[PDB]
Write a protein that binds this ligand. Structure first.
Ligand SMILES: C[C@H](CS)C(=O)N[C@@H](Cc1ccccc1)B(O)O
Length: 264
């Protein structure tokens, strides 16, 4: 992957102070936009979209997996588990946990689903099984957020994220009802309004999944976008920075998303 008009991205990256990673594809034309698309970035919570897809895939083999109630304990509630905490007294179904992991980035819900799938290794295996050789999840929440420069644990590349997303939302990796459910969950995300969605015209339908590690200026978003009358665009925007105290920027993510959409 390459880009012979990369200077707008390079200047945005210089102004940001860190590294920016972008990959976008127009699935109707095949056109792509690329910038550090092959470089590893921390997933942060963006793994949760793929976790929900892996749960949907499994549900194709075990009838009733999605409606299975989980009565989890208080000590499942690691920080930033707003849905899991609200529903602690009732428990939650696997489907509800998946939705909360996607749409609220709920940490406890993510850890409970990971356990159901055999931990980070289990999710990584699912991703290998759809042909993603870049993705790796190694740790649970919250340890996977350490985002240490050059550490390959819990990382992927913008291109591999985009390709896997396209397979799961638009290709054949998931059966049709599962596929629609994944898309529906993404379209209902609540955490993404200042990221890719901020660059998308308000009349284009969008589903997305954010990630925010909290250190090293590391944050991200991926999305499927439906332009009017066209096949969808799929894209991924990841950031990191070299100092632990560096701030992430939602505005940088939005700006990089817009440069990608404009290039297409
Ligand atoms: C440690 C860090 C929050 S400071 C964290 O748990 N991030 C996950 C979800 C998240 C994002 C923004 C605020 C709180 C939680 B995720 O893995 O991105």
């Amino acid at each position: 992957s390459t880009n012979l008009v990369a200077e707008p991205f390079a200047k945005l990256e210089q102004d940001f102070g860190g590294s920016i990673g972008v990959y976008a594809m127009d699935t109707g034309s095949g056109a792509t936009v690329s910038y550090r698309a092959e470089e590893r970035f921390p997933l942060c919570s963006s793994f949760k979209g793929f976790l929900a897809a892996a749960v949907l895939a499994r549900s194709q083999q075990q009838a009733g997996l999605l409606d299975t109630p989980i009565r989890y304990g208080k000590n499942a509630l690691v920080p930033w588990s707003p849905i899991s905490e609200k529903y602690l007294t009732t428990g939650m179904t696997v489907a509800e946990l998946s939705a909360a992991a996607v749409q609220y980035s709920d940490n406890a819900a993510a850890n409970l689903l990971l356990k159901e799938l055999g931990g980070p290794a289990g999710l990584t295996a699912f991703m290998r099984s759809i042909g993603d050789t870049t993705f790796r999840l190694d740790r649970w929440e919250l340890e996977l957020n350490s985002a240490i420069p050059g550490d390959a644990r819990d990382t992927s590349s913008p291109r591999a994220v985009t390709e896997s997303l396209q397979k799961l939302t638009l290709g054949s990796a998931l059966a049709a009802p599962q596929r629609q459910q994944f898309v529906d969950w993404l379209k209902g995300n609540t955490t993404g309004n200042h990221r890719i969605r901020a660059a998308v015209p308000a009349d284009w339908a969008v589903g997305d999944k954010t990630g925010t590690c909290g250190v090293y200026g590391t944050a991200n978003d991926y999305a499927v976008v439906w332009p009017t009358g066209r096949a969808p665009i799929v894209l991924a925007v990841y950031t990191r920075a070299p100092n632990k105290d560096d701030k992430h920027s939602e505005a940088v993510i939005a700006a990089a998303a817009r440069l990608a959409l404009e290039g297409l």
